[model samples]
Target chain A: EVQLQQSGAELVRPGASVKLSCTASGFNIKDDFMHWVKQRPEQGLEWIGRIDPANDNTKYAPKFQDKATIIADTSSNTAYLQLSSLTSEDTAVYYCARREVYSYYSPLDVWGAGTTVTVP
Target chain B: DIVMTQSPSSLTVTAGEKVTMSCKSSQSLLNSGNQKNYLTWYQQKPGQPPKLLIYWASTRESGVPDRFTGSGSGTDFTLTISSVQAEDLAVYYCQNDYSYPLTFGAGTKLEP
Candidate 1:
């Protein structure tokens, strides 16, 4: 079965940055795009952005383009999302997912369990 | 950025009953030149990750229950639960992948 193993929770102060990781198993990480999603405490989900590990290409949701940086390391089969300039509003559970479809423009199919980040 | 709104933010239904949730996008999500809705549905149960249930508006993902169906076009859409089951109790969200940022609806809570 496919699985996305994510890093542990983090506690950070306002104005700092936090980087989270998501490593995948049972699939080729470089063959697909990795997506990041955020869910605030007691709130709904938000799409952060996505990265293509193959070509190191990336796309950010306009809202997140200025707040997060997405990167990947194919050798480790890991994708990373870095939230910079964190604030109280940035506190949330973050998830990394992959589009399992054979082609681009497909929806996210598999997702990581998620990681909780708290900004104080 | 598109704004997604879901109606009846929360609803309660008994097992075997039928339920329907609505999702409306702020702008037309229909792909230019094509009339297909770029909508997708997801279910997020407590203490678990969100899972994909429907995509492209109404196409059921593999392994999804037959009781779940989606229908709609342009800016409006619906996710219908033909017969609610205990396992179907969860929060449902609608997303539009046609546009950047892939906005999601506020979400509808399904309760028993």
Candidate 2:
């Protein structure tokens, strides 16, 4: 019953940066890695990065290493995705998610509704 | 980074018909260091987030219907939907969790 409630849609012009947020409810954000995924219009899923709330560690897909910055405030139970130097190519629906497992790494089991970013 | 290549990018099947799709990873998804395969399947319906259908290869997620089956290992995997229901229409994706980046396949779309 854990829920990742993401922030609303964003409409930003090219070249502007935007920070998107997802607040975790019903589950402790510090329990596991908080991941961010991107899906461009009509395209498949793309993993941007993940932030470990427990230690503030983070990592990103090579393609997103420069375009995305991941952060989380465990106390606030919120995870954030910051996309900078925006361009039309960055227009996509970004989803904040959490991993699953009895222990080791697993698939993303809980996800936010997704925040639509429109870079025009 | 492990690359996941999914086949039959799209399928149009009638109700009650069975559907099958495949995903081949650039490298083996098996992790001798820990859990096997480290691969999973997801179902993404229109305007909704992808739902975890299967993980750890063939293991089904809790509450997921029995009709959806995941099989295969090493570099290749398959997801089969038996007695495809109307609500089963959606885009399916296979992802590799054995390595960093956790690459996902291009995805397979099912339509009626």
Candidate 3:
């Protein structure tokens, strides 16, 4: 049973950067792909990007290429998402999920509780 | 990015009633090499993250209620709740994993 413990809510000023962390337990971070998804207030899910902890390889949505950076620390089984040059539009709840199956990608089996990030 | 469009925006039902939600993709999700559609359904309770309900077009996730069913292929799919329960009151979203920048439907909210 893999569990992801995310950092607490953050309220950072506009133009500043915030790094959110997701620490995984009951599993090895280097063995899987960790993904980040965003949901604005009362909105649908949006994929931000995914990071393969094994080699630090990453992929980001075209729209978020300049807004987000994904990285991981395998030694501590923790992944990080840093949002830079933020504004009100960046305010949303971000979630961390892991792709469990080696072959398919439909299901993101494990997830974090979600961290609320507010840019004021 | 594959566009996922869900219908009805919201659904209202009783505990004993059945309801079906739909999802339409702008592009086909069928993989000719494997013959599998990369569609999936998720349930998001109030104040909680989305949970996997069904995947591979019709395969129910482990421990998912038998009352919940998934069907359809290619570009259209449906998630049917045989008997909506109190705990089933939430937002249901559909997604496709066939390509990058995975997209999700607007989600259909279930109400009593």
Candidate 4:
């Protein structure tokens, strides 16, 4: 019964920065890793990165090295993804998900409904 | 970085018929130890987030229909639909989470 509550839709201008949040429930946030994924129209899912909430250790795709940031707040059971230097290509739906412990290679079992971001 | 490539970008099937989708990764999904495939499958319908379908190559996610099956090894994999249902029409994606830049297949769309 894991649940991920996400922020509402957002609209940002090119070159701006946007931050999205995913709040969790029904599970212990510190027990597993949290990941961020991006989906654009006509394109597939892109794994932006993941964060280990316990120590805040993070990793990102080389393509997203400086453009996106992954952060977590263990106290709040929440994770954040910040997209910087936005563009029309950055407009899409973003999701935050949780992976199970002892199975790091598995698919995302729990996911936030979604947060749509529109860049104009 | 891993690249997940999906095929048959789209498919149209009738009720009770079977449908299959494929995904291939740039490298072996098997971990360095080559003991397991870090692959998984997902189902995403219009206006909804993707749902886990299968993982560890063939393990179905909890509550997923028995008709949905995943199979393959190394870099090649398949997601099979035992019986096409109207509700199954949507996009399917395969993902590799074994390494950084967790990658996803472009996606296969199922249509009526």
Q: TM-score order of candidates, best first? A: 3, 2, 4, 1
Model 3 B-chain TM: 0.97
In terms of lDDT, the best-performing candidate is 3
Q: Write the per-residue lDDT of candidate 4 for residues A1-120, one digit (tens) a residue.
A: 679999999999899999999999997778788888888886588878888887788888888878999888888988899899999989899989987665635457889998999998
Q: Which tens-of-lDDT digit does each residue in B1-112 have in candidate 1?
A: 7899998898978998999999999988788665667899999998789999998899899999889999998888999988799999999999978878778888999877
Model 2 chain B: worst 10 consecutive residues (lDDT sum) = B29-38
- The reply for model 2, stretches above 4 Å from the true place, is A100-106, B33-35
Worst 10 residues of 1 chain A by lDDT: A100-109
User: lDDT of each prediction vs. the true structure?
Assistant: 0.89, 0.88, 0.90, 0.87
Candidate 1 deviant stretches above 4 angstroms: A100-105, B32-35
Clashes of each: 0, 0, 0, 0
Tell me which residue pairs clash in candidate 1.
none
lDDT of 4 by residue, B27-96 (tens): 9988667577889888899899998888887888889899999999998999998878888988998988
Tens digit per residue, CA lDDT, model 2, A2-116: 7889999999999999999999999887877889999998768998889888878999998999888998887798989988989989989999889743375556888899999
Q: What stretches of model 3 exceed 4 Å from their correct place? A: A101-106
What are the per-residue Cα lDDT tens digits for candidate 2 across B7-75? Answer: 999898999999999999999988777648888999998889999999988999988999999999898
All candidates: TM-score:
0.93, 0.96, 0.97, 0.94
Two-way DockQ contest, 1 vs 4, winner: 4
Clash pairs for candidate 3:
none
